[PDB]
Design a protein around this nucleic acid. Sequence first.
RNA 1: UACGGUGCUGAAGCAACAAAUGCCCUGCUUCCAGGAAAAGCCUCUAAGCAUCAGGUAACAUCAAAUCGUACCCCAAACCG
RNA 2: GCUCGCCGGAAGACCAAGGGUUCCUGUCCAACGUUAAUCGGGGCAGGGUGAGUCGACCCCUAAGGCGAGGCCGAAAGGCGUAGUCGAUGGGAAACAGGUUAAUAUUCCUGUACUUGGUGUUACUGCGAAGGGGGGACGGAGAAGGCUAUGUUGGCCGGGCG
RNA 3: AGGACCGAACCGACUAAUGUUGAAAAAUUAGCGGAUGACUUGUGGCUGGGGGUGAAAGGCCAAUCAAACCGGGAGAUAGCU
RNA 4: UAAGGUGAUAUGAACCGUUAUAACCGGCGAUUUCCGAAUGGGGAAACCCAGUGUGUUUCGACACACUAUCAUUAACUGAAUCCAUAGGUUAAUGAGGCGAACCGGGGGAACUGAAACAUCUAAGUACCCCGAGGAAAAGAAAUCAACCGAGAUUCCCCCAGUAGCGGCGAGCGAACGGGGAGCAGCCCAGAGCCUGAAUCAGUGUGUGUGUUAGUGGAAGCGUCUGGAAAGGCGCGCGAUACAGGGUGACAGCCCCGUACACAAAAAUGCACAUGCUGUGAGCUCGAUGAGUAGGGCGGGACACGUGGUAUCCUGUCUGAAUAUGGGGGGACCAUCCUCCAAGGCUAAAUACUCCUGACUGACCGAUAGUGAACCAGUACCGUGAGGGAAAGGCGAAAAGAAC
Lengths: 46, 102, 93, 77, 63
Amino acid sequence: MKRTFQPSVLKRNRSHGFRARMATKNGRQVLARRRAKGRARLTVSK
Amino acid sequence: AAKIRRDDEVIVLTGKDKGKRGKVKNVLSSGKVIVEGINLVKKHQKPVPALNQPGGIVEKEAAIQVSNVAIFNAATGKADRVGFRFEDGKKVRFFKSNSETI
Amino acid sequence: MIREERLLKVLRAPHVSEKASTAMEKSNTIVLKVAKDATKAEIKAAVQKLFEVEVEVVNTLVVKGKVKRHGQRIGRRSDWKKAYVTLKEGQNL
Amino acid sequence: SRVCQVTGKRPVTGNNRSHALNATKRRFLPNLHSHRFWVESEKRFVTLRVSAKGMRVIDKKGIDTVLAELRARGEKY
Amino acid sequence: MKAKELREKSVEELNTELLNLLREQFNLRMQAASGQLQQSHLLKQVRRDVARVKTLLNEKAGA
RNA sequence: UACGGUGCUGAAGCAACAAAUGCCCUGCUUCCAGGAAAAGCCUCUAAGCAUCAGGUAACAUCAAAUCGUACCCCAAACCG
RNA sequence: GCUCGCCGGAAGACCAAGGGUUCCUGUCCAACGUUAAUCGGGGCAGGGUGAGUCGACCCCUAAGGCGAGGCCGAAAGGCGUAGUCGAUGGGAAACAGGUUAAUAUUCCUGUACUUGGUGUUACUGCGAAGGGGGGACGGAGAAGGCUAUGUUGGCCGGGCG
RNA sequence: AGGACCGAACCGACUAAUGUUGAAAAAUUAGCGGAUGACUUGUGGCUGGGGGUGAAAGGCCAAUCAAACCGGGAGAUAGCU
RNA sequence: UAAGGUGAUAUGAACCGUUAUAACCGGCGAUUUCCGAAUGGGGAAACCCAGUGUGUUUCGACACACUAUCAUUAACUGAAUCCAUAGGUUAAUGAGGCGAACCGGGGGAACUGAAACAUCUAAGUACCCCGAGGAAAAGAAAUCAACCGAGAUUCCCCCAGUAGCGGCGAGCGAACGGGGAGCAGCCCAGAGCCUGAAUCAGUGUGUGUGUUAGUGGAAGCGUCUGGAAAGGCGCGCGAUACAGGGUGACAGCCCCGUACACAAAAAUGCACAUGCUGUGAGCUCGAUGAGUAGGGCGGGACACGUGGUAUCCUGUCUGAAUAUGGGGGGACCAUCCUCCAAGGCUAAAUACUCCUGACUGACCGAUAGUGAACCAGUACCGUGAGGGAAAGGCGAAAAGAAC
């Protein structure tokens, strides 16, 4: 049937993307925590 | 800095046949030196296009460690160690036990 | 003073050199591998200068890279841009 | 914000102690009112957020001195 | 020091740069992708020579 | 002919009837629940400029760059 | 290759999303494929995606988002004017035939069309976050005129079963 | 004209049988209701956790809901096993 | 510095080079696409689209620089409204952002314990936010002390689980005083004699010492077993080196090094007789920090829960004396003693480790030690924040098995 993930790249970059994280102070802290752990993918928008 | 250089008559201290004396052909960076007729390896070479086309079992020189060989003095028939002493950048190598520039 | 001839390093490989390229040559066009940021005007000017041919139009496309690498370690080849250079009048080749 | 602009008074946090000494956090807020003050030297009315203690120090020290203190602090009018 | 480049210290190196890049690196690139033998070292030599000319231009703005 | 596919030639190529949920139709009639905005476009002026600029028409020429383009096309390539 | 069966308002064909090389050619069959595999959407190389007209970009907005100043808030921050973004909506222009193993409104052949710049000639009052027009709009129902398209006949080539 | 009637697409889910280590972490096959409207669907957007939203069922808020998920307090505490 | 190099998996090809010029190391410069504080505007990061100024007798057009915002300052302008003011433009300077911990401030839980729970505790902890510096904070007595005196802050050890606080339960818990580390005090509330007078900053090529390249560096041979001696045996040698690693087994004398001695074009960091500039010594007299101290109300901090409760802070309302003075000595009064708030700066002792270098380990040795010895915050899961693995070893040398 219809499942929880129905993909859309525009919604994905608008919600979980780099500039969505960069607009907020809290999402900037999110990007800082990912950078501190060492992840190759800081954001899944790429 | 290099006690054993590219063209030097060297005598084997340890390993395989010690008494054999050979000339250096090549000095590799892993601390290993290639001397003519010292370590003989019989390598089975596969027939392949371009280089090594006939194949066959080939006798070639294997690398010997540079610490297992010593330079041979012509004046005294023995292995004698290497030092450097000269005031400028091109330090000359000297045979110890004879104090003569190699 | 000569114009921006240093910018005309855009042309990279003399041919892609395949069957589509050779049949397209038998019609009118040379197929070339050109930069990544090269524009059609620069490909026109570069071909007209580096070779003596006076050219008609340039059609361009980007060939995306193929993965072409195994399961344990995965890689991607580089993207490259291909120019079909139309040469109906005065073609040396 | 609720800053006195003359005496630097901010909302300070404390407790609402009960008869059973139960403690719930509360904010003491200043007596802040917008007041229009006449400056005779500059011939104008300056609109200042000011506490009651601020009005008291304005009549004590003059409006010019409080304004000069604000210029020295760097606060705008 | 390793390499002495007193030869490149001269005025108007633009023509030498155009010689080193234009037709030289270009025909080396064309012959390299078609297939030729010595270009493996010639391309590296031409690239380092262009680097020498451009470094000397950035040193001497007047030339 | 390895069956792919090439070179050449190529007859007739009309009429009547029935036809949509498609076009006329952003129409017409009727109803009440009363049916986006801004630009492109047309037109008129303000500042300004007056043999200028600008506009219109014709002709001629030049330019239209960059990115996608294969494939899956309600599914063995999407979500499961 | 010859029969048989199935779908045929699809189990046929095409756009969008989404995937990303799964498309084409050659070679291989260890692993994957619920079997074997010579086969494959599998491995490995090499090809292939050609645009002024098709989308994007772009010009303009909607819901909405951000929002210099500004108002407010203990700090973070909340809201909001000018404005600036945001298609799912409104702005220029291409169709038939052929082509490759793989691309086609792109390549070729034929016939077009649009929007700017410049030059020439001729004529002339032109000119803006300004005004107006315009874009510019609902539901249902009913003809009528057609067309896509089909049948039948005429014509043409073949058959004489 | 009709929150009109019969009925496909479409939306839903009334009964039965099969499945229940399934073909499927709610489906299949026969029947069933609505089907010009309080209808349906695509694309964006807005509402955020003792809060939202609810033609109201403790329903829904990513197979999670009488207070989601993720990290921290945290090695909470556990007279219990 | 060098006889060898073009990083590794990863060989091959094509070459470069003989120490006097190939690689390698170090100092200094050049270039440094795009995104990212992103800074010309926008954006769904790594893309879309501009403006201004400089360069087609090449009528395709290209290259370069600048243009974000905020604060301070100056200029030029400039409304309602006359003078003004708000605003607008230009120029300069600074700020953005990141970072593991330490430090200061603004807020601030609950599980839990009390064998329930509400005062209390957990705790000003976890967390969020702001700010700063290599440290930060504090700091020069309106302090303690007791008729003796000590003499700024900060950290350690006692006092001492003491005195007290407390549903006087749970539990919280000092100070006086003594021993140590380290030990500078100053300046403005203002005038006359002095304007690098001694400091303090900026600022130097001077001198010394370090750091970032390096150089030299001693002394072993016979014989046995073995595939191989570093081991066994015999006879020696160096030792300011017998730290360590490697070499075909266990090497002081085989190789890197090691004790020891030396070296730095250049760039820097410290210290100083020091090279320049500006503030600023000291004398004399005058001042002695008011919406402040204090009080009322409500709260917070002091070990101190409002109690008998001194001290400190202020949200609200009030409100002095002004050196004849005022504060403190734990309700309060008298006496006595001590000290001058309502203005600031101040080094060391103290805290921490993202990073560098050496050394050390009764630390681990591939289910261990970091999650990660290994191409690991990767594969893989999830919309996302986030979670998150397994996986070392041929041999001395590939001699990696021709036929």
